[PDB]
Amino acid sequence: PISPIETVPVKLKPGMDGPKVKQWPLTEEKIKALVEICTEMEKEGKISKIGPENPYNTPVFAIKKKDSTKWRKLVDFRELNKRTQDFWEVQLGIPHPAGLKKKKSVTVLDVGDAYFSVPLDEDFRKYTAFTIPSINNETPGIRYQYNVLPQGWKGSPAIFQSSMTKILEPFKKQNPDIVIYQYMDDLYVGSDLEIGQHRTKIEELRQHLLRWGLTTPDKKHQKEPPFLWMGYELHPDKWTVQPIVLPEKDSWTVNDIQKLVGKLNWASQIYPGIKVRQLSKLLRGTKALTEVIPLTEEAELELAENREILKEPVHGVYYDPSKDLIAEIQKQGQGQWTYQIYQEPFKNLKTGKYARMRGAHTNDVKQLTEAVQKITTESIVIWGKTPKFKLPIQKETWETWWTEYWQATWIPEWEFVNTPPLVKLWY
């Protein structure tokens, strides 16, 4: 390539040294993939091999493109991101449209292919050093640093930003109603047209981009239907509140009410307006449990009254952009998974539920990863940012298999919880 540009200086936040992160061991198979890839990347000049004077290191993985014939290198730039992109969240912040979630449809196309033209300020490369590993560590790792803006690094989108608006401008012109938002490596395009027009309005974009340089592999299929659904299509106006409803019942037993008193008592942390005494007093006894019992004075009052203060979202729940978004996911069993996304306990900015299919073809670890990526995309689409996940799965298992079904080009942050208590109940 002939220098498309001539580099943008990049400086980490003061009192900050580049990344030095260990590089997880990997499946032989995956090493070979990386190996192959980097060999080309090295020819194409995207990456060069480095020496011992480069102490830095960001992790690298191999994932299945989108199940295509080959692997994809996924550099975990999370460490280098915090050490830069944050002050390039400012320095070059990419503004987030609060209407994208309102579109009748939002498509996601991979434009990460763009960057690989744009050389990277030289004094910075040294920090993108990533290492492909050796089995058993017999051989010293192979080492490379990035010669161009690299995918995954939130300073790549920002530097290309400028160049993107340019590419997109003569389209946002003839499509003033379609919103286009860029996050890291993806374009989120949203339109209120009947899908048919939309999808087309997209290939209309797919090609605008195309005839101006960029390439969006996003050619999911062709006329023949080997039952492989089309491009990433989200429908955010149907992004709506989930069910948190008590059980309506003919005959109520002592047990039933008991639980019902607990669910509510738990709820009292999200809704200070709920009450139970008149419902609980009905249990003050030490009666059996299989025994069915009736209402009380305002029992039916409290159950329905509450049943109301509970069918309208809570208030004071505002999105603080200063804070990070947090997300818990509890395993519901039988392929379902609930999730809250919040910034301060109980003030849920949003909840919901993911679910897979029936046994035979899916496991836990795949589901969760799928749920995580769906919650992340949702979050990106709604707030422009990904949330720190509170994953219910032994760290190590997760670390061992997350990559196994990862398709996202980004890595949300995450940690592991060893105790979802009553929550699975309430939700």
Add this chain to the structure above:
Amino acid sequence: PISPIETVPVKLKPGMDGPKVKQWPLTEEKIKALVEICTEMEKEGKISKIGPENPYNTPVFAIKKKDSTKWRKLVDFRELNKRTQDFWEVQLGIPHPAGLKKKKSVTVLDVGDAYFSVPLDEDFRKYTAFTIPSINNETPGIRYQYNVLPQGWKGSPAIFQSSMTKILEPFKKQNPDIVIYQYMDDLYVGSDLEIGQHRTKIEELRQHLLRWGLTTPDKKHQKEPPFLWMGYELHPDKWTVQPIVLPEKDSWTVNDIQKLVGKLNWASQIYPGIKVRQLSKLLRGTKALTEVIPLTEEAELELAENREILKEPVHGVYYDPSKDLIAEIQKQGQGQWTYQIYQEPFKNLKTGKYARMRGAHTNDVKQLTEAVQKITTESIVIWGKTPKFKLPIQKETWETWWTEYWQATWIPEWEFVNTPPLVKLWYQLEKEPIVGAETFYVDGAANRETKLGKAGYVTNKGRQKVVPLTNTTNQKTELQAIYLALQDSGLEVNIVTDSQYALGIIQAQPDKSESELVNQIIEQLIKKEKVYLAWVPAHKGIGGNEQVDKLV
């Protein structure tokens, strides 16, 4: 002696600058000891007579420890180092033998004096300047600057391994059969030729290296296989641990109990079945280093059994990528699990253990999954793949538990291997209250300061009880209360508690826990036909738990 190797550019940390430390005393004999060395060193080019111009300085010493014939120049770069940039790590993790591959002939070249052969980034030399004092008059001081890689310096091991790796690459290509692993002053070469031919290749490599200023000697001090390496004992087709030594003593002190346990884990890589639960239980008091600890009864028994094991020598085989990787685990019983990874029925590939140190409550199946995970991770590092498993658990169990468990899991390819002990759910709690069943409204509180509590129940049938307990905490009473109801209930029972603590613990469906209380309980759980537990908010909650708390 020195080569046309390219130099790695170097740097001093951002703000810093060259070391200016002095040391000008003079042991006449030594001064001429160093001068001799430098003259034979500057002659060889490794150093240079420098001109008095800003050189910072570094300490020079003469050394000769035992069985003298010669001396040794020694410079102290502790201050230069504290000023030089950071370099790519070395061997972040030592390769495990269990994963090395079988060879016929293995040879080790001495690449010790090597680094002096490798060039030092011109520009950085200016700092390497030391100064050997001429005996007295406070003379100009015979002064030098390094041209190669100083023996002390920070970036030498790196810049070296770096350089050496490059020099080999070509050779390494044109000769894939040859494994070349270097380990500090060592560079091993292993192959599949027969000693004659093998030694051809060795020489070629030797000559090749010579063409790059790195020289090597033919024969000097030590022996060949077994190769004493990284606490291992390496053989051309087998591998094992360094002869380990379990000492016998009258009194053991923490430091002594530590070095003992450490050695045991180390011996576990290959010696099947070694245990350690007891001797470490002792070290659970992390203070002293010389506090003496009385080998309790079990610890001793254990240590012993570890001797019968180590009595017999044992060795491991290598990895053949054509065959399968299998892994088998067996429960030892105290939270101890063992495993051996092989491809072949008689000699092993590697062995190891998985104890449940973590906390004070856990199930036998989860533990099995924890061990299966530990091995999965280990295999990925060592063989680059997951082993197939063979385990004492039946799908019905497993598939059930992972279904009930609130955490996600992913246990791989596994074949059932019927052999005691066995892993199973010794009991399950009911999901719906039991009709007809007596309902025990359990409770028990304790006085936080007087350490005095109570545990009781009041049933639907009007039946009561309260048992005074001393020296316990709510949690203890909260459990004893559930244990009570179990003792006095019948085959079927419905128990209501106000304690999440208690509830959880029970529900975790623990196999055991040395907390004898929970044992008494778990075992009653086993003996019952159908139990049903129910949680119910404390304070404000039910009226039956109130009627027992007003009591306590």
